[PDB]
Amino acid sequence: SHMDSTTIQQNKDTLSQIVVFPTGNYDKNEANAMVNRLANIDGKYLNALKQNNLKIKLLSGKLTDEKEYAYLKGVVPKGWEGTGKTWDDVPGLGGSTVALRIGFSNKGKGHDAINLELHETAHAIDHIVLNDISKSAQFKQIFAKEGRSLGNVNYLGVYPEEFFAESFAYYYLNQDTNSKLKSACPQTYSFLQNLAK
Ligand SMILES: [Zn+2]
């Protein structure tokens, strides 16, 4: 804990080669803050994303106003049936790509994650780096036991890919969320610790 500056330096170096900033207007300080939070992710994962030419696209407006996500206009996200909401209303996505609306990091800004950028980037790490580890037999057993223990039982507790992404965000956001994950989901915590060891 005496050389965190070096890990941040390396991870921000990596992120400067992954993050793409948008045309048009946004809060530059908040975009910088999002990158700073991403810099807590283990550098091995960040460098694996970089090798795969994954770009983390920060957006100045709605997700579906980007040409590459216009196919989601009017579409209801998985698990959002009955809400009257669509992807037009959702500030981030992760998987084969990552796209994130600047300013919408905190829980409740159109999404349910503890932190937008960490949750969405976790989806990309799951898919691109870890070969869909959230669907592995090992993770299935952990999810069967612990998958409701971050709440949102009808969403996180039903979709292992979402429980993986949310647990990853708790692990990496700050010391408080990291400790909360250890207490609530000890096997998931140990699983994530060992992946990065
Ligand atoms: Zn998600």
UniProtKB/Swiss-Prot annotation:
One of its GO terms (cellular component) is extracellular region. Residues 78-80, 94-96 are annotated as: Interacts with substrate peptide. The record marks 112, 119 as: Interacts with substrate peptide. This is Pro-Pro endopeptidase. Is inhibited by the chelating agent o-phenanthroline in vitro. The record marks 155 as: Transition state stabilizer. Keywords: Hydrolase, Metal-binding, Metalloprotease, Protease, Secreted, Signal, Virulence, Zinc. The gene is zmp1.
